[PDB]
Design a protein. Structure first.
Ligand SMILES: [Cl-]
Ligand SMILES: [Cl-]
Ligand SMILES: [Fe+3]
Length: 335
């Protein structure tokens, strides 16, 4: 019940240097910045996007154990609740494994449980509402408005246990389920979403009966399950990719063949094929509308986590055509 209304809050990274995040998102993507003797932290984001980047200042800190194992990565996906203690006690009664019991600081009551791999979920309760946006330009074309979802690579044979956790413990709903096969490789994608609709996790499981792919590379190079990419809803995906490209952001490629045969599959209503081809944006549709997605290259030293831009017209979930296309694009840039 305290869990029923949970909303996506901040995404905490552990990083070796706060300036790697600054150079990446602030200087590259144009996000704003808003900055315990064991951790140095800064906040980066805009509108509804809120990242906390923390670099440990001592070896005896969880962030040092993280960066050693994974490098820079997502270590905690915080969930805003109206009551952090009540949400904690309910989730633990449901099976959740506690990481930190409820404690109050100044403007937050927090309680952390474990999530996929070694990534935490902190329940966070604010006294007067969530912090204000770091920067605001929601009405600007190409603006990055919110985090639409997260992609999570899981070890083979751990997908259904991950799904059961978020559904049984956290009450998420299953909104997508398909096994994707491309060439001699295959995967299983199951997307779970909070009843509030703001917390969406696409769970990806490699198919070990096939040949290995970039899913298998991530799991091996990251060091287990973790966030593969983070998707930013964009106030117009053609303009968001255009501006980012002018700032030095490199995106994954999609051959011209994709756009030559596109109108026999879908007729994009918002954009033209030349626009889509130029920016390398992928389009799909379902019963309610169309969906546009694109992946940015990973700038991570291990080539693991990367970023996605998405714009929804009527499409409220995920399409199998974009999922298949987005796999190929990621498979072409790394494995
Ligand atoms: Cl709250
Ligand atoms: Cl990256
Ligand atoms: Fe995605």
């Amino acid at each position: 019940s305290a869990l029923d209304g949970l909303e996506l809050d901040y995404v905490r990274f552990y990083v070796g240097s706060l300036d790697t995040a600054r150079d990446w998102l602030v200087r590259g993507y144009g996000l704003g910045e808003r900055p315990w003797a064991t951790v140095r932290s800064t906040e980066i984001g805009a509108n509804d996007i809120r990242f906390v980047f923390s670099e440990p200042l001592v070896d005896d800190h969880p962030g040092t154990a993280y960066v050693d194992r994974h490098g820079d990565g997502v270590s905690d996906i915080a969930l805003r609740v109206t009551d952090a203690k009540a949400a904690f006690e309910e989730a633990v009664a449901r099976g959740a494994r506690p990481v930190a019991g409820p404690s109050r600081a100044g403007h937050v009551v927090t309680a952390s449980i474990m999530g996929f791999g070694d990534t935490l979920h902190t329940f966070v309760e604010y006294p007067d509402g969530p912090p204000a946006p770091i920067a605001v330009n929601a009405e600007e074309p190409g603006a990055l408005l919110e985090i639409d979802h997260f992609a999570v690579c899981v070890e083979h044979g751990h997908l259904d246990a991950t799904v059961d956790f978020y559904r049984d413990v956290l009450g998420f709903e299953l909104i997508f389920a398909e096994t994707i096969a491309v060439g001699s490789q295959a995967m299983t994608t199951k997307v779970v979403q909070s009843k509030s609709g703001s917390v969406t996790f696409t769970l990806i499981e490699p198919d070990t009966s096939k040949d290995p792919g970039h899913i298998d590379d991530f799991l091996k190079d990251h060091g287990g399950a973790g966030v593969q990419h983070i998707a930013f809803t964009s106030n117009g995906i053609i303009e968001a990719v255009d501006v980012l490209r002018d700032r030095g952001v490199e995106f994954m490629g999609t051959p011209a063949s994709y756009y030559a045969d596109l109108l026999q599959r879908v007729v994009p209503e918002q954009y033209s094929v030349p626009e889509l081809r130029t920016q390398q944006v992928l389009v799909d549709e379902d019963h309610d509308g169309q969906l546009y997605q694109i992946f940015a290259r990973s700038v991570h030293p291990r080539n693991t986590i990367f970023l996605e831009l998405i714009e929804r017209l009527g499409a409220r979930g995920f399409g199998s055509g974009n999922i298949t296309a987005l796999y190929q694009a990621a498979e072409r840039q790394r494995d």
